[PDB]
């Protein structure tokens, strides 16, 4: 699901004018918002204006600095990494998000266009083929776990 | 200075970690000695145009060429035109093959369909004739492209025709005196001159004329094939490297270049593990210099060892060496290079720590090699990096994540204020009871998760499965319910390419006609002509306005080519409640495949209004809180626990285990059937099916889905 | 356990950058030539590769147009336009380009200029406007403090009768088709395109090179002036149109050397 | 000298299987395409069947069909074989001489009536189950005099299937199409290196090339010999069989050969153990 | 025409695909038919193909038969691509006019809808006359609005032809009021349709301000029409597929349907609207007869209202005299009584009379060019000004007159007042250009106006910001979430919280939107005549290019004249204005032959 959430986030960053994709991407499990937060964001127009302005800033960082600066500014401003680490069972989700971010940054340097990385991510979502780099890693090594 | 063994593998990670720093943390960087990639959508498109007779002419390979703005602006195709052409290629059945002669050239039988010429004829027939008229030359028209937007089809047909001509142009082998105007004519035909892409086309022409001049300098007389020139141009275009920003003032990122030693204060080395460095180049085997070495001979291994020596000598103040020691995949030990191993062996044998003055030789060497080795953590949010001491992380963004002082993820279910309106339509109730969580998402908070459409397949459909088979079965059932000619619908579906080619499409149509005739023997056995009527109801001060289609005096008759499911039973029960509440004495029947039948007897108006008030209360409860009523798994649990003979639910442990087994079977399906738990609407609420939420879904299904199995017969 | 993160006290590095001038900023006629950056670089390569002493051969111009990829019909007008440019002298005494031998000419001299002071635009533009007469208009450009090296590529340096001269080429000239390229229009183009700072840095580089190479060097005795050549403005009947000769006041160079030195 | 290795070979294999299904299954008539549809739904099921045989070393098919026998010839042979049994049933109808047993019910003639509904046309492929009631091995266990029961038992002795010829043609065509596509594109695969080295050592001059390998490394220590393809052991027997001054050390374990799905084979290890003389544990 | 000679690649590929191995006559006919369908002509007469083609004897040497195929009908019927309407062929030849199959189906659907389904609803004439007397206060002379309302409530399908400023919306309000007052016990689900969202918003606000003026009842206010829907929104058009929700099987559950602005309704959208209608709904079409043509190929309203010049019938004149109680004239001759009865012509304009030169110029546009020259010439009626635009000094004078037209806008912008008055001052003066690019177009005039605002100290503009204070923007795509439609203007300014764009909603409020939330934004200092339809401006100024173009025709100048309320300026040559009136955008269609029998 994290690849689909990253695809929704990249579609909301690339096209922030249409509010439907932004509203579908903000309510994902990566942001960590309740239904009351989404309702108050849809009711207050000024909060949605601030959201559209900061997503346009994220798009400017994505066009000027790259993929990983935009994702690091998103994880630092929204503070979703601390919320995923405080959540029980979210460390695997955070490691998968970081691995998807590393793969998107590796595939985004070879493509000059900005929509081409989104099309490559949608293609790799639609292609379930397993490479040596595109597999799941170990989530933690410090905590002892039962190894299957 | 920072030197890597391979610059192209590490340079994305270097750019990622150097760009992501904030304004107080940002240091300027300059990456040199990379492979020159000036404009990849121009060079890769020209390489794909040079591979035109060898290409299979797949639809994705032409849409990737149309993704290039130069090739799209040459034939006056906009981005909106490309977005329309995506679904125009995907829906009209264009899979592979430009012409039928291209299919016959590849030693394949001429099918006549699923090609670019077939799709072009289909789109032009749709521009000329509506799809409801029928076939003209065994080609069904395409009713989408009808107005002036089909002029963009006239641009696409302007492209593929050119893709025929060079396909007949680049096939024959030509001598080097004839390949001169070919690249120029290809560039002025397929590409348009622009301000940005002028230098790329100039470099392409310069490299092509340089290859032709180097070939004609030797006065080559024989013919030269196209693939050799394509591979030579692909090798020569990626041969360039840029080093203009090598010492501009920002920190230098470059690979190890031989015979270049510059003194620096801080010298960092990356990728010093074994296998990567030293870069080993295998000899040709028939070279005579490798057999008898002399004094002035040069090899890449000795050059890399001398580069490591020059990096050791050239370091003035600080020397940093980092290598991959642990595998990120399987946590396997990755040994470093032999140069770094000899360096740490000389360090351990030539130096000792003042804590252990005279202990041993091997133990002091191991203690020095363990003190110098800083085994960093696997993840950046580990609290070991932020421990105060010798080393401490400078990442301020990961400080509250490593401190573990943040709030956890709260539950998405929250009590929201909702006022039930006066006029609630029947379509809203049908969309609610079709999927309650989806109606809570896409209508209350207006969050509809938009999934991207599937890609175009690389081959023609040999079998029928999924949405296409369901649409074919639905049209065949709608044709056989009026006793129409099934052979005309067979020719209509074969003229569009949705059927398999030859006898297999006839076999599929015969077995689907047999199944739909077996269903229609039960459907039209009790079918009466009925018209659509209006519904205006007032329940608990709530107005329900709508329309019911095909209302016969026998009752309600619905037919769908699906399986026995609880959602269609809920829809039929809602239609029966909205039908029996205003007159209408009679049963309600729905006939599915494999002898599936949902029947509800006629009930009184008071019980119908009571159940309608219960459904209205469930609708107003589903808008405030997410109503956890699973139709399929909850109905399976209920019908495992329900007993229609005694009209009471069993409470023994064997039924409580069989209901849990059926719930786990219906929630998470097998490897062939997509289960109910594999859904984007259910994974947002919970990630793992807890037994408390399972019992909550069980209680909600016992509260709501109970008249589905109570009045079933 | 309790933990915190370190904070950087100062800047990681000063504004050090090695930049150039661009970082601090009938049917066949030369007026109907396509105006762009690539034809300008093609004309610069044509003037670089051609020998000034040898006469222009038409088959060589045809081979250069075949190598570049331009039209073949432009070639007999191109060779006579090239010979009309080369026959026109560009000096205050009337010295042509054919009188320069191979030892006297030096094409595309690349120089690096150091600067250790923070280059403030307000302290530099007033010093430029104090001596340069073309700075009556031309409001000052805005650029950051550049400390380090500066790259430059002079087109041609040539000596004659014991006096050195600098020559640069400009070939865009999109807005003129008639004979209106007088000295006022060329001065307006110099003020608009801001080539005064480039010419002043070229004079400073040539002064430092002649001071480092030749011992007992005087700026007034050896240096003669700077010539700019507009290729589309050279006419056969107008010797002054197309060329632009400017000499500094010999007081800005020493102050600029003292500013760039320290 | 320079080639491009591909990590995934399933796409070109599926493309060659689609090419085989286009050039073989499309011009067939209805009476053959019905049997082809009864064997496999599409080329994906055929690829799922033969995916373990398309990769690695191609196995030897016991009793292969001849090169001149097509699908139509096999279909006509099975049609004539069914028609002979139909003719022998139509000639010997209307009589019953077997003794009535306690297991044998008196409704068997109704099953014969089902056979009266069976001989209508030869367009079908699957016979009735009631012919299993007309077997001499089953009627004696529950008295057969006519050889019609013997002909019925001969018809039901072997399965009437077109599957083996299509599998043989697929194994002959798809691998050749994959090799042709990779030779046109200039690409190479993981098993293609083994096949190229085996074809090099299979030639006449390439044995001298093995001597060059004896010039290159006059020793070999081969770990994990249980996971060894037969092409690999054929190469290692071509290089280091009985030549002097070279040593071969096959270090392995026959009790750990669990990669038989990948391409390994314990029978190659048993052949290697039967060939060598010394054993160390 | 000039563009008709330069063949599009679509027409060439269509001729190569449809004809293929057939005769070159069929290839040339298919290419000419595709080019006429791309230009907007519905039908192709065989006389133009026979006479105005140079290769017509050459194809006479191509065909070789017993009868030699001298006629075009036999030569087309010999091929497999042209049939009489029986075989599923792309090209149809029925009435000596060759069309496509879709165009023939839509033309026969329109002819069936306007010839057979339009029956006479018989109602009480006394109560209808009483409601028309109690609703319309004018009963002294002939009023065309009362006759239009009577002939719209009498027949099922009725077309009301009228120009701007003639009180059409008041006539629709009186018609709906008499419709509800006639049928008291019978329920009436009135629906409103519009081609664009901005015209739908204008229709909703106009009917809201009109229907609340008339006195109603407690049950009469319950049956007030709720909203006006788009034609793609009422029928249920999908973005991906062309499948409608109410295509053929289930019609729209409506009682009466008022479709405003039928001049912008093309033939496929009209045929899709016709096929969705039941056998009991009454449809009232609105629009101008001499207005601009539709967007896509087709001309429905012009070919319908072409028979309005003949007049009514002899029985229908007595029926209208018994209904309205006045003297209704009769039309001479009887060709199609149903269509001539269903039509009506509005001539009495209430917002402007004969004293204003705008109505006289609009009457002289449909006449010869000398009538328009005589209208502009004598004394100018203090409403229409004529400025000659030939050289650069005329361009400077035009920019000076545009600055004098936008003077109150700059005065309210510089004084830092409320944005509502700024929008109300900007909506009084408007430039209308024909083309888009070049020196005479949208992007040319917008960049020239921005350069003139950069030169003179009127508007401060940052070159790298692109969102300076005072730029007018317009949206190109609809956005129902933000409440803005296609063709709505907004003014970007700084209220104190930042640079935001204020839009004037039709509900009376003003909305301040972020410029990053705008999906589309184009500079609207000068609008195209095709995109400025439906709106109204107090002081309009037409700018026509000197180069001859097929866009500048009689209907373009007619829509430019009627766009102005009081003041209108012209910047064009005398020869171009004389040639645009005679060159009428005629569209060849088979409705002239199907309605004649």
The angle formed by the CA atoms of residues E84, E86 and E92, to the nearest 5 degrees, is: 40
A135 and D CB contact within 8 Å: no
Q: Which DSSP helix (H) or strand (E) runs through E159?
A: strand E158-161
Q: Tell me, yes or no, if the two domains E1-100 and E101-346 fold the same way.
A: no
Asked if residue B212 lies in contact with residue B181, where contact means CB atoms within 8 angstroms, the answer is no
Compute chain D's Rg from CA coordinates. Answer: 27
Burial of residue B659, with CB atoms counted within 10 A of its CB: 0-12 exposed, 13-18 middle, 19 or more buried: buried
CA distance linking residue E569 with residue B309, whole number of Å: 84
Phi, psi at C149, each rounded to 5°: -115, 155
Phi, psi at D70, each rounded to 5°: -100, -175
How many C-alpha atoms does E221 have within 13 Å on its Cβ side? 8
- The answer to whether chain E touches chain B by having 3 or more C-beta pairs less than 8 angstroms apart is yes
Asked if residue B597 lies in contact with residue B589, where contact means CB atoms within 8 angstroms, the answer is yes
CA distances from A70 to A2, A104, B12, B17 (A): 17, 12, 15, 12
Kindly identify which residue of chain D lies nearest to residue A131, measuring between CA atoms.
D7
CA distance linking residue C209 with residue C164, whole number of Å: 12
Fold of E1-100: Arc Repressor Mutant, subunit A (1.10.10)
Asked if residue E500 lies in contact with residue E492, where contact means CB atoms within 8 angstroms, the answer is yes
CA distance linking residue B154 with residue B147, whole number of Å: 12
How many C-alpha atoms does B285 have within 13 Å on its Cβ side? 6
Interface test with chain E among A14, A17, A19, by most E beta carbons within 10 Å: A17
CA distances from B388 to A82, B393, C3, C98, E134 (A): 21, 9, 7, 75, 93
Q: Tokens representing B111?
A: 């099918």
CA distance A121 to chain E (A): 23
Asked if residue D43 lies in contact with residue B462, where contact means CB atoms within 8 angstroms, the answer is yes
Q: Closest by alpha carbon to E518, among A15, A70, A39, A25?
A: A15
B381 and A CB contact within 8 Å: yes
CA distance linking residue B382 with residue B405, whole number of Å: 14
> Residue E57 contacts by C-beta under 8 Å, 6 or more apart in sequence?
none
Q: Which DSSP helix (H) or strand (E) runs through D222?
A: strand D219-223
CB neighbourhood size of C62 (10 A) = 15
Phi, psi at E158, each rounded to 5°: -140, 140
- On chain E, the residues whose CB falls within 8 A of the CB of A18 are 519
DSSP tag of E381 = G
Q: Closest by alpha carbon to E433, among E324, E289, E266, E570?
A: E570
Kindly identify which residue of chain B lies nearest to residue A35, measuring between CA atoms.
B412
Asked if residue B560 lies in contact with residue B568, where contact means CB atoms within 8 angstroms, the answer is yes
- Residue B91 sits in the same domain as residue B217: yes
Burial of residue E447, with CB atoms counted within 10 A of its CB: 0-12 exposed, 13-18 middle, 19 or more buried: middle
The dihedral through the CA atoms of A33, A37, A42, A46 has a sign that is negative
- On chain B, the residues whose CB falls within 8 A of the CB of D20 are none
- On chain A, the residues whose CB falls within 8 A of the CB of D10 are 129
3-state secondary structure of C157: strand
Angle formed by the axes of helices E442-455 and E392-405, nearest 10°: 80
A17: left (phi over 0), alpha (psi -120 to 50) or beta: alpha
Asked if residue E470 lies in contact with residue E565, where contact means CB atoms within 8 angstroms, the answer is no
- After which residues, if any, is chain A broken (C to N > 2.5 Å)? none
CA distance linking residue D98 with residue D145, whole number of Å: 8
Asked if residue C34 lies in contact with residue B193, where contact means CB atoms within 8 angstroms, the answer is no
> Residue D246 contacts by C-beta under 8 Å, 6 or more apart in sequence?
D214, D218, D219, D220, D240
CB neighbourhood size of B334 (10 A) = 14
DSSP tag of D121 = B
Q: What residue ranges do the domains of chain E occupy?
A: 1-100, 101-346, 356-584
> Residue B95 contacts by C-beta under 8 Å, 6 or more apart in sequence?
B58, B59, B114, B115, B456, B457, B458, B459, B460
Ordered by where they begin, the domains of chain C are 17-262 (3.90.320.10)
- After which residues, if any, is chain B broken (C to N > 2.5 Å)? none
Q: Closest by alpha carbon to B435, among B564, B560, B619, B575?
A: B619
Q: Closest by alpha carbon to D65, among D77, D48, D54?
A: D77
3-state secondary structure of B179: coil
DSSP tag of B141 = -
Structural domain of B506: 456-527
Cis check: omega of the bond before C118, within 30 degrees of 0? no
Asked if residue B675 lies in contact with residue B668, where contact means CB atoms within 8 angstroms, the answer is yes
CA distance linking residue B271 with residue B7, whole number of Å: 10
- On chain D, the residues whose CB falls within 8 A of the CB of B108 are 19, 22-23
CA E45 to chain CA centroid, Å, is 26
The angle formed by the CA atoms of residues E343, E347 and E352, to the nearest 5 degrees, is: 145
In CATH, D8-56+63-188 is 3.40.50.9100: no
Asked if residue E235 lies in contact with residue E272, where contact means CB atoms within 8 angstroms, the answer is yes
Q: Which DSSP helix (H) or strand (E) runs through C39?
A: helix C37-49
Q: Which DSSP helix (H) or strand (E) runs through A97?
A: helix A91-108
CA distance linking residue E259 with residue E273, whole number of Å: 10
CA distance linking residue B126 with residue B147, whole number of Å: 10
The angle formed by the CA atoms of residues E355, E357 and E362, to the nearest 5 degrees, is: 120
CA distance linking residue E542 with residue E527, whole number of Å: 10
CB neighbourhood size of B625 (10 A) = 15
- Residue B477 sits in the same domain as residue B568: no
Q: Closest by alpha carbon to B206, among C34, C42, C33?
A: C42
Q: Is E302 annotated as a binding residue?
A: no
Q: Tokens representing B211?
A: 């290859």
Q: Tokens representing C70?
A: 């331009």
Q: Which DSSP helix (H) or strand (E) runs through D200?
A: helix D190-202
CA distance A7 to chain E (A): 21
CA distance linking residue B237 with residue D24, whole number of Å: 43
Q: Tokens representing B554?
A: 């026998």
Given B180, B214, B242, the domain boundary residue is: B242
> Residue B111 contacts by C-beta under 8 Å, 6 or more apart in sequence?
B103, B460, B501, D22, D26
Q: Closest by alpha carbon to B14, among E214, E114, A109?
A: A109
The angle formed by the CA atoms of residues E299, E304 and E307, to the nearest 5 degrees, is: 130
CA distance linking residue D118 with residue D125, whole number of Å: 11
CA distance linking residue E434 with residue E442, whole number of Å: 8
- Residue B220 sits in the same domain as residue B316: no
In CATH, E101-346 is 3.40.50.300: yes
Q: Which DSSP helix (H) or strand (E) runs through B234?
A: helix B226-237
- Residue B107 sits in the same domain as residue B212: yes
CA distance linking residue D198 with residue D182, whole number of Å: 18
| Of the partner residues A24, A132, A141, the one whose CB lies closest to the CB of residue B448 | A24
Beta bridge partners of E526: E431
Q: Closest by alpha carbon to E192, among E200, E202, E184?
A: E200
Contact A19 E516 (CB under 8 A): no
CA distances from B499 to B89, B149, B455, B494, B504 (A): 17, 28, 19, 5, 8
Kindly identify which residue of chain B lies nearest to residue A143, measuring between CA atoms.
B382
Q: Tokens representing C193?
A: 């395109």
> Residue E540 contacts by C-beta under 8 Å, 6 or more apart in sequence?
E429, E430, E431, E432, E560, E563, E564, E567, E568, E569
CA B549 to chain CA centroid, Å, is 39
Neighbours of chain A (3+ CB pairs under 8 A): B, D, E
Q: Tokens representing B24?
A: 């107080």
Asked if residue A22 lies in contact with residue A41, where contact means CB atoms within 8 angstroms, the answer is no
Contact B407 A83 (CB under 8 A): yes
> Residue C5 contacts by C-beta under 8 Å, 6 or more apart in sequence?
B386, B392, B393, B394, B395, B396, B399
CA distance linking residue B247 with residue A111, whole number of Å: 26
> Residue B516 is part of a domain; what is its CATH number?
1.10.10.990
DSSP tag of B457 = P
Q: Is E163 annotated as a binding residue?
A: yes
CA distance linking residue A53 with residue E513, whole number of Å: 12
CA distance linking residue D230 with residue D214, whole number of Å: 21
- Residue B495 sits in the same domain as residue B548: no
Asked if residue A42 lies in contact with residue B445, where contact means CB atoms within 8 angstroms, the answer is yes
| Of the partner residues B87, B128, B154, the one whose CB lies closest to the CB of residue E18 | B128
Contact A19 E481 (CB under 8 A): yes
CA distance linking residue E372 with residue B132, whole number of Å: 49
C4 and B CB contact within 8 Å: yes
> Residue D220 contacts by C-beta under 8 Å, 6 or more apart in sequence?
D236, D239, D240, D246, D247, D248, D249
User: In which residue are the tokens 């545009």 written?
Assistant: E402
The angle formed by the CA atoms of residues C129, C135 and C141, to the nearest 5 degrees, is: 85
CA distance linking residue E207 with residue E173, whole number of Å: 7
Asked if residue B605 lies in contact with residue B633, where contact means CB atoms within 8 angstroms, the answer is no
Neighbours of chain B (3+ CB pairs under 8 A): A, C, D, E
Q: Tokens representing D229?
A: 């393809």
- Residue B552 sits in the same domain as residue B482: no
- Residue B136 sits in the same domain as residue B53: yes
CA distance linking residue D197 with residue D207, whole number of Å: 11
Q: Tokens representing E138?
A: 């004018």
CA distance linking residue C73 with residue E320, whole number of Å: 79
Phi, psi at B549, each rounded to 5°: -85, 145
Residues of A near E (CB-CB distance < 8 A)?
16-20, 49, 52-53, 56
The count of structural domains within chain B is: 4
CA distance linking residue B480 with residue E129, whole number of Å: 54
């Amino acid at each position: 699901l994290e690849a689909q959430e990253m695809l929704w986030l990249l579609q909301a960053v690339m096209t922030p004018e249409r509010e439907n994709t932004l509203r579908s991407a903000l309510a994902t499990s990566m942001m960590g918002l309740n239904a009351l937060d989404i309702e108050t964001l849809n009711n207050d127009e000024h909060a949605w204006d601030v959201v559209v302005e900061e997503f346009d800033g994220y798009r400017q960082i994505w066009r000027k600095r790259g993929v990983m600066p935009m994702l690091r500014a998103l994880m630092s401003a929204r503070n979703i990494a601390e919320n995923l680490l405080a959540t029980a069972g979210g460390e695997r989700r955070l490691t998968d998000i970081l691995h998807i971010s590393e793969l998107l940054q590796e595939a985004g340097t070879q493509l000059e266009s900005e929509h081409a990385l989104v099309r490559w991510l949608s293609q790799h979502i639609l292609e379930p083929d397993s490479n040596a780099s595109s597999q799941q890693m170990r989530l933690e090594s410090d905590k002892h776990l039962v190894q299957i | 200075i920072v030197m890597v063994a391979d610059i192209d593998s590490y340079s994305p990670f270097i750019q990622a970690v150097f760009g992501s720093a904030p304004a107080d943390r940002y240091l300027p960087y300059a990456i040199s000695d990379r492979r020159a990639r000036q404009s990849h959508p121009v060079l890769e498109a020209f390489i794909s145009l040079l591979s035109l007779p060898d290409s299979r002419f797949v639809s994705e390979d032409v849409l990737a060429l149309l993704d290039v703005p130069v090739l799209a602006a040459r034939f006056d195709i906009t981005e909106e035109g490309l977005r329309y052409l995506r679904q125009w290629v995907n829906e009209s059945g264009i899979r592979w093959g430009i012409d039928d002669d291209n299919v016959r050239e590849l030693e394949l039988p001429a099918t006549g369909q699923h090609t670019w010429r077939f799709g072009l004829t289909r789109m032009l027939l749709g521009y000329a004739m509506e799809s409801a008229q029928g076939e003209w030359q065994s080609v069904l028209p395409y009713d989408e492209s009808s107005g002036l937007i089909a002029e963009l089809v006239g641009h696409l047909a302007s492209l593929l025709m050119q893709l025929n001509i060079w396909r007949r142009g680049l096939a024959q082998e030509r001598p080097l005196e004839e390949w001169l105007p070919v690249c120029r004519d290809m560039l002025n035909a397929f590409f348009l001159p622009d301000a940005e892409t002028e230098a790329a086309m100039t470099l392409i022409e310069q490299q092509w004329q340089a290859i032709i001049a180097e070939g004609l300098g030797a006065q080559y007389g024989d013919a030269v094939p196209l693939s050799l020139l394509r591979d030579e141009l692909a090798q020569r275009l990626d041969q360039e490297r840029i080093s203009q920003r090598f010492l501009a003032g920002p920190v230098n990122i470059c690979t190890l270049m031989p015979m270049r030693s510059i003194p620096f204060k801080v010298v960092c080395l990356l990728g010093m593990n074994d296998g990567v460095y030293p870069r080993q180049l295998a000899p040709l085997g028939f070279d005579l210099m490798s057999q008898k070495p002399k004094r002035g001979d040069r090899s890449r291994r000795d050059d890399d060892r001398y580069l490591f020596l020059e990096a050791l000598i050239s370091a003035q103040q600080k020397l940093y060496i980092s290598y991959i020691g642990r595998s990120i995949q399987d946590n396997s030990e990755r040994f470093p290079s032999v140069l770094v191993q000899e360096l740490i062996d000389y360090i351990g044998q030539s130096h000792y720590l003042p804590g252990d003055e005279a202990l041993n030789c091997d133990e002091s060497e191991a203690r020095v090699k363990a003190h110098l080795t800083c085994l960093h953590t696997r993840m950046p949010f580990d609290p070991q990096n932020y421990q105060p001491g010798e080393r401490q992380s400078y990442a301020r963004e990961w400080l509250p994540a490593a401190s573990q002082a943040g709030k956890a993820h709260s539950e998405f279910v929250q009590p929201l204020p909702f006022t039930l309106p006066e006029t609630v339509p029947l379509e809203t109730l049908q969309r609610f009871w079709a999927h309650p969580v989806r109606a809570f998402f896409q209508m209350r908070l207006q969050v509809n998760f938009r999934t991207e459409d599937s890609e175009i397949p690389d081959t023609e459909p040999f079998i029928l499965e999924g949405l296409s088979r369901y649409q074919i079965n639905q049209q065949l059932l709608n044709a056989l319910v009026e006793q129409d000619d099934a052979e005309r619908l067979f020719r209509r579906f074969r003229a569009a390419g949705d059927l398999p080619y030859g006898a297999f499409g006839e076999i599929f149509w015969e077995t689907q006609c047999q199944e739909m005739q077996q269903l229609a023997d039960r459907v039209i056995a009790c079918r009466q002509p009925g018209q659509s009527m209006e519904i205006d109801l007032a329940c608990n001060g709530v107005q329900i306005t709508g329309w019911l289609p095909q209302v016969q005096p026998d009752g309600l008759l619905r037919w769908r080519p699906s399986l026995l499911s609880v959602a269609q039973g809920m829809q039929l029960w809602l239609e029966h409640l909205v039908y029996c509440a205003s007159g209408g004495n009679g049963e309600s029947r729905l006939f599915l495949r494999k002898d599936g039948e949902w029947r509800f007897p006629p009930l009184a108006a008071e019980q119908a209004l009571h159940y309608l008030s219960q459904l209205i209360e469930g609708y107003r409860e589903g808008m405030s809180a997410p109503l956890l009523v699973l139709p399929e798994s909850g109905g399976a649990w209920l019908k495992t626990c329900y007993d229609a003979q005694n009209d009471a639910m069993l409470d023994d442990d064997s039924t409580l285990q069989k209901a849990r087994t059926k719930f786990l079977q219906a929630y998470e399906g097998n490897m062939m059937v997509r289960g109910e738990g594999d859904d984007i609407w259910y994974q947002r609420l919970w990630r793992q099916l807890t037994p408390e939420t399972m019992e909550a879904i069980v209680e909600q299904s016992q509260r709501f889905l109970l008249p589905l199995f109570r009045f079933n017969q | 356990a309790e933990l915190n993160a370190k904070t950087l006290q100062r800047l990681p590095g000063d504004n050090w950058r090695v930049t150039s001038y661009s970082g601090l900023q009938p049917t066949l006629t030369p007026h109907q030539f396509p105006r762009g950056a690539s034809p300008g670089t093609f004309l610069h390569s044509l003037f670089e590769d051609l020998d000034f002493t040898q006469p222009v051969d038409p088959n060589w111009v045809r081979e250069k147009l075949e190598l570049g990829g331009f039209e073949s019909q432009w070639e007999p007008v191109l060779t006579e336009w090239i010979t009309a440019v080369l026959q026109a002298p560009l000096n205050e005494t009337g010295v042509s380009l054919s009188q320069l031998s191979a030892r006297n000419k030096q094409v595309e001299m690349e120089f690096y200029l150091p600067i250790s002071e923070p280059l403030i635009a307000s302290q530099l533009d007033t010093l430029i406007r104090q001596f340069d007469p073309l700075s009556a208009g031309c409001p000052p450009l805005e650029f950051m403090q550049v400390r380090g090296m500066l790259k430059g590529f002079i087109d041609l340096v040539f000596r004659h009768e014991g006096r050195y001269y600098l020559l640069a080429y400009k070939s865009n000239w999109l807005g003129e088709d008639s004979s209106a390229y007088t000295q006022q229009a060329m001065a307006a183009a110099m003020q608009a395109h801001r080539y005064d700072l480039q010419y002043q840095l070229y004079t400073l580089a040539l002064h430092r090179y002649l001071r480092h190479r030749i011992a007992d060097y005087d700026y007034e005795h050896h240096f003669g002036g700077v010539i700019y050549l507009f290729l589309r403005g050279v006419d056969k009947e107008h010797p002054q149109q197309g060329i632009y000769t400017t000499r500094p006041n010999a007081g800005l160079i020493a102050l600029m050397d003292e500013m760039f030195a320290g | 000298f320079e080639q491009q290795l591909i990590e995934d070979e399933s796409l070109l294999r599926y493309q060659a299987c689609a090419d085989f299904w286009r050039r073989h299954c499309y011009p067939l008539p209805r009476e053959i395409a019905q049997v082809v549809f009864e064997t496999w739904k599409g080329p994906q099921a055929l690829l799922r069947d033969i995916n373990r045989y398309l990769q690695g070393e191609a196995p030897v098919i016991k009793a292969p069909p001849p090169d001149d026998e097509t699908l139509a010839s096999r279909h006509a042979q099975i049609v004539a074989r069914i028609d002979t049994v139909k003719q022998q049933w139509r000639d010997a109808v209307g009589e019953l001489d077997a003794l009535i047993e306690s297991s044998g019910i008196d409704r068997r003639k109704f099953n014969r009536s089902n056979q009266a509904k069976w001989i209508d046309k030869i367009s079908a492929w699957a016979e009735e189950e009631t012919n299993s009631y007309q077997l001499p091995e089953s009627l004696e266990k529950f008295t057969p005099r006519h050889p019609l029961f013997e002909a019925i038992d001969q018809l039901l002795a072997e399965p009437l299937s077109i599957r083996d010829l299509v599998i043989t043609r697929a194994l002959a065509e798809i691998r050749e199409t994959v090799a042709r596509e990779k030779r046109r594109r200039g690409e190479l695969g993981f098993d293609d290196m083994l096949s190229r080295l085996d074809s090099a050592l299979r030639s006449e001059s390439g044995e001298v090339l093995a001597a060059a390998i004896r010039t290159r490394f006059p020793v070999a220590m081969i770990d994990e010999f249980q996971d060894t393809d037969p092409q690999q052991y054929r190469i290692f027997r071509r290089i280091w069989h009985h030549q002097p001054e070279t040593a071969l050390l096959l270090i392995g374990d026959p009790k750990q050969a669990i990669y038989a799905f990948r391409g390994a084979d314990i029978f190659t290890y048993m052949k290697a153990r039967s060939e060598v003389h010394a054993h160390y544990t | 025409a000039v563009e008709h000679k330069q063949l599009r690649p679509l027409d060439v590929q269509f001729a190569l695909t449809v004809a293929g191995d057939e005769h070159p006559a069929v290839t040339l006919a298919a290419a000419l038919l595709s080019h006429d369908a791309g230009e907007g002509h519905v039908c192709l007469p065989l006389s133009r193909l026979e006479n105005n083609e140079a290769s017509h004897p050459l194809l006479a040497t191509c065909v070789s038969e017993i009868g030699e195929l001298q006629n075009w009908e036999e030569c087309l019927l010999a091929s497999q691509a042209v049939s009489r309407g029986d075989e599923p062929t792309p090209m149809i030849l029925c009435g000596d006019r060759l069309y496509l199959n879709r165009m023939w189906c839509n033309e026969r659907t329109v002819a069936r809808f306007f010839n057979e389904v339009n029956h006479a609803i018989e109602v009480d004439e006394a109560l209808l006359a009483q409601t028309l007397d109690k609703l319309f206060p004018v009963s002294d002379e002939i009023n065309w609005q009362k006759v239009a309302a009577a002939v719209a409530l009498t027949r099922r399908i009725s077309v009301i032809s009228g120009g701007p400023g003639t009180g059409k919306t008041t006539t629709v309000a009186k018609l709906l009021a008499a419709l509800i007052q006639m049928a008291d016990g019978e329920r009436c689900r009135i629906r409103l349709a519009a081609p664009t969202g901005k015209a739908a918003a204008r229709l909703t606000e106009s009917l809201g301000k009109a229907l609340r003026q008339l006195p109603l009842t407690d049950e009469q206010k319950k049956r007030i029409p709720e909203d006006a829907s788009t034609l793609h929104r009422l029928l249920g058009a999908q973005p991906g597929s062309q499948r409608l929700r109410h295509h053929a099987g289930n019609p729209l559950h409506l009682d009466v349907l008022v479709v405003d602005e039928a001049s912008m309704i093309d033939l496929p959208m009209m045929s899709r609207l016709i096929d969705a209608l039941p056998d009991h709904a009454r449809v009232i079409f609105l629009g101008d007869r001499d207005q601009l043509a539709s967007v896509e190929a087709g001309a429905v309203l012009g070919d319908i209202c072409a028979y309005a010049n003949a007049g009514f019938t002899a029985e229908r004149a007595r029926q209208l005299s018994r209904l309205t109680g006045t003297h209704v004239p009769a039309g001479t001759g009887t060709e199609a009584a149903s269509l001539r009865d269903s039509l009506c012509l509005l001539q009495k304009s209430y917002r402007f009379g004969s004293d204003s030169g705008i109505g006289q110029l609009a009457a002289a546009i449909n006449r010869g060019d000398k009538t328009a020259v005589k209208t502009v010439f004598q004394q100018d009626f203090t409403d229409i000004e004529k400025r000659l635009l030939q050289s650069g000094e005329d361009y400077i004078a035009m920019l000076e007159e545009a600055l004098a037209g936008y003077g109150r806008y700059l005065d309210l912008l510089q004084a830092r007042a409320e944005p509502d008055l700024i929008i109300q001052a900007f909506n009084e003066y408007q430039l209308l250009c024909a083309l888009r690019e070049g020196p005479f177009g949208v992007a040319g005039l917008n960049e020239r106006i921005e350069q003139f605002m950069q030169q003179k100290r009127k508007i401060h503009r940052h070159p790298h910001s692109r969102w300076y204070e005072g730029r007018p923007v317009m949206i190109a795509r609809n956005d129902s979430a933000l409440g803005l439609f296609n063709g709505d203007i907004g003014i970007a300014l700084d209220r104190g919280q930042g640079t935001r764009v204020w839009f004037a909603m039709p509900d009376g409020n003003i909305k301040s939107v972020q410029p990053s939330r705008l999906p589309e934004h184009e500079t609207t200092w000068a609008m195209t005549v095709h995109k400025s339809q439906g709106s109204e401006f107090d002081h309009a100024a037409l700018i026509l290019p000197s180069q001859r173009t097929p866009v500048v025709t009689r209907e373009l100048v007619y829509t430019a004249v009627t766009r102005a309320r009081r003041r209108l300026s012209l910047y064009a040559d005398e020869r171009i204005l004389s040639a645009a009136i005679a060159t009428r955008t005629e569209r060849r269609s088979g409705l002239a032959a199907l309605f004649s029998s």
